[PDB]
């Protein structure tokens, strides 16, 4: 469904303790030794919220990776109750 681009050979290399804050929202190239893995966890990618007041499920809304979007109002029927997720129709992504 989607494609990704993997940048390589960035000029500047910073150690972990030298990140400070100027490198915020910036591309960095750091090196280290891996310590802990958290396994492979599915993460919501194309979540389809359902509207039980409408009758059926709503459209697939792209889930921003910063935070979990919510259906406060249904733009169609103004439903405050149903904003749940159906794990069958939802398309997930890997996460570690």
């Amino acid at each position: 469904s989607e494609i990704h681009v993997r940048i390589s050979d960035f000029p500047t290399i910073y150690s972990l303790r030298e990140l400070r804050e100027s490198n915020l929202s910036s591309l960095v190239r750091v090196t280290g030794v891996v310590t802990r893995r958290t396994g492979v966890f599915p993460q919501l990618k194309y979540v389809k919220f359902n509207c039980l007041k409408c009758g059926s499920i709503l459209g697939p809304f792209f889930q921003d990776s910063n935070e979990e979007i919510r259906i406060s109002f249904c733009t169609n029927c103004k439903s405050k109750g149903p904003f749940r997720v159906n794990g069958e129709k939802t398309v997930y992504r890997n996460y570690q």
């Binding site: 303790r17 400070r20 804050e21 915020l24 310590t35």
Partner: protein, 617 residues
């Protein structure tokens, strides 16, 4: 508004603008502050060094008194004044290229108050505190200026600066909102300040009689973060600030409270310190740092005919009668060249000495002399110490909170000498622990959700009495010790100290001791003072001696003789570890003579030390 704050701010602006003083005999009258403004502009720095005496001389010290006594209120006024000064003179560096958060780091204050001397009246004032760095935190971003997105009348609005408590904008980009429901931050537009919380202990010398070392938590912001070292004595300058405390609710005594519908907030606090200026209390770098007076002292010191003996006699002034031990301690202090192989092996480059001797033979005196003299050194006793002490430990961040790494004794002695007094009495489990680190110089912790790999390149100086408290004439050194033969093999030098009923030495040592009690100073005068020794050791450490091709042969036949002489029964059997040790001592000797090439004299000295250290049964 406040008239006094604005008046003091403009007075500060004027004083900075017209600051004048004679500069030495050269540079005439230099507006040091105004010129240093562009000096720091050259690198576009973020600190402005306000020496206290400058602020103190003017207005009969009234400005300095106002700033020190009520710093917290005046600081934003001083920030605005500094911005106006930049606007009037040197406006080229104001923009970050929003605006650089310039740091006013005061220093050269009159007195430094101890942790125990912290008082509740002086909060909000400026002072200096001196303590030992024990625990440091990560460089976590701190929210200083934030961008807020209004849930209602949605948009993006920046420049909503963050206060000590959370703050959100009451006015909206579309004014019809005037609602503050879900003002949302964003990563790309908010502004952050580097932050670090460092825990400091009270210094050992200033500890009150019969009391524990009181601790303190110090906040570091801006360019002053990540400056302190665990176990490094440092001084902190800044303002005392209070932070909320949720622990002291069950303590006796009434509690501060408010009423506003209860409208009540439980008000408790604990005192912390926000700091601005913190300082620590290639051979070209060390040479550059060296002043010429010392550089030339060093030049005649370096070109001395007999520098080895004069260095030996200059170490351990208090102890009399032990010369080989002094040589070994000097070599350990200097160290060796850390060499890494292509296949991954990291050749050991520090000297570890285990000193065994009869009771009352200045062994504890040697260890106490080394610490407080060798930079980055830690003294411990055998029984009152544990693996969590010697090696790194795990403890909670804050009480009732997540755990974190605790600085162990070995790491506090990294690239330094660690003195382990009474090694034999120390427990066998901790013995396995210390030796395990000694083998690989790396101590790893894998408990409570932390798997950090912590390295410790530490030279270990071990002292231990023979079993039974008295050396057995019949038994060997290994027979009079409780450690294993592999432990002997790991250690480099064994200086078995013995006590003998020699009248001349008894008389001379009695004279020496009663004179040392007689003359509080000048009882014995070493040729070189502490400063000269420290510097020489520092300079010698920078050089890296290289083995000449010719000396390799002499090493080979010397190791042949060493292998032949024993078991032709001695304290330690002859092994290859010994041949490594021969270089390990040779590099230290070459550093001592301030040479760069290994000569057969150095191998002769090292073999002399190893043949004297080994003791016939």
């Amino acid at each position: 508004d406040d008239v006094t704050g604005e008046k003091v701010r403009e007075a500060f602006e004027q004083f900075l603008e017209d600051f004048s003083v004679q500069s030495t005999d050269t540079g005439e009258v230099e507006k040091v502050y105004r010129a240093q403004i562009e000096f720091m502009k050259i690198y576009d720095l973020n600190t402005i060094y306000i020496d206290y005496q400058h602020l103190s001389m003017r207005e009969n010290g009234a400005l300095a008194m106002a700033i020190s006594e009520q710093y917290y209120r005046f600081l934003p006024f001083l920030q605005k004044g500094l911005r106006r000064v930049v606007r009037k003179y040197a406006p080229e560096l104001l923009n970050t290229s929003t605006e650089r958060v310039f740091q006013i780091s005061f220093f050269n204050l009159p007195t430094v108050h101890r942790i125990r001397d912290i008082r509740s009246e002086k909060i909000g004032s400026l002072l200096s505190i001196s303590g030992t760095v024990t625990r440091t935190s990560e460089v976590r971003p701190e929210l200083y200026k934030a961008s807020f997105t209004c849930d209602m009348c949605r948009a993006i609005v920046d420049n909503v600066e963050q206060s000590f408590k959370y703050t959100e904008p009451t006015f909206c980009p579309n004014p019809s909102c005037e609602n503050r429901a879900f003002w949302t931050l964003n990563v790309t537009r908010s502004r952050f300040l580097d932050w670090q919380k460092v825990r400091i202990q009270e210094n050992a010398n200033e500890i009150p009689t019969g009391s524990m070392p009181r601790t303190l938590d110090v906040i570091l912001r801006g360019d002053s973060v990540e400056r302190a070292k665990p176990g490094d004595r440092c001084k902190f300058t800044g303002v005392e600030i209070v932070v909320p405390d949720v622990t002291q609710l069950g303590l006796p005594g009434v509690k501060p409270s408010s009423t506003l519908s209860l409208g009540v907030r439980d008000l408790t606090y604990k005192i912390s310190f926000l700091a601005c200026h913190v300082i620590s209390i290639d051979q070209e770098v060390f040479l550059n740092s060296l002043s010429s007076d010392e550089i030339n002292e060093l030049k005649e010191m370096v070109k001395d005919e007999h520098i080895y003996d004069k260095l030996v006699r200059s170490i351990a002034p208090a102890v009399f009668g032990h010369e080989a031990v002094k040589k070994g301690i000097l070599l350990q202090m200097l160290g060796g060249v850390h060499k890494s192989t292509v296949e991954g092996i990291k050749l050991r480059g520090d000297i570890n000495i285990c000193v065994v001797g009869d009771p009352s033979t200045s062994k504890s005196q040697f260890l106490k002399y080394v610490v407080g003299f060798a930079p980055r050194s830690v003294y411990t006793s055998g029984k009152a110490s544990s693996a969590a002490g010697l090696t790194a430990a795990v403890v909670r961040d804050e009480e009732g909170g997540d755990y974190t790494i605790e600085a162990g004794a070995l790491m506090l002695a990294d690239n330094g000498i660690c003195c382990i007094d009474e090694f034999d009495k120390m427990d066998i489990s901790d013995q396995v622990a210390i030796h395990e680190a000694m083998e690989q110089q790396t101590i790893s912790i894998a408990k409570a959700g932390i798997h950090a790999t912590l390295n410790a390149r530490t030279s270990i100086l071990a002292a231990a009495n023979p079993v039974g408290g008295r050396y057995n004439r019949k038994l060997s050194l290994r027979g009079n010790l409780n450690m294993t033969a592999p432990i002997m093999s790991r250690f480099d030098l064994f200086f078995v100290i013995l006590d003998d009923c020699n009248e001349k030495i008894d008389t001379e040592l009695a004279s020496h001791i009663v004179d040392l009690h007689m003359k509080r100073d000048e009882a014995i005068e070493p040729p070189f003072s502490a400063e000269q020794l420290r510097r020489y050791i520092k300079y010698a450490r920078t050089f890296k001696p290289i083995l000449t091709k010719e000396a390799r042969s002499y090493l080979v036949e010397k190791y042949k003789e060493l292998r032949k002489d024993d078991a032709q029964r001695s304290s330690y059997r002859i092994t290859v570890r010994q041949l490594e040790s021969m270089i390990r001592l040779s590099e230290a000797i070459a550093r001592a003579n301030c040479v760069d090439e290994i000569t057969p004299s150095f191998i002769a000295e090292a073999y002399d030390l190893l043949r004297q250290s080994i003791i016939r049964v």
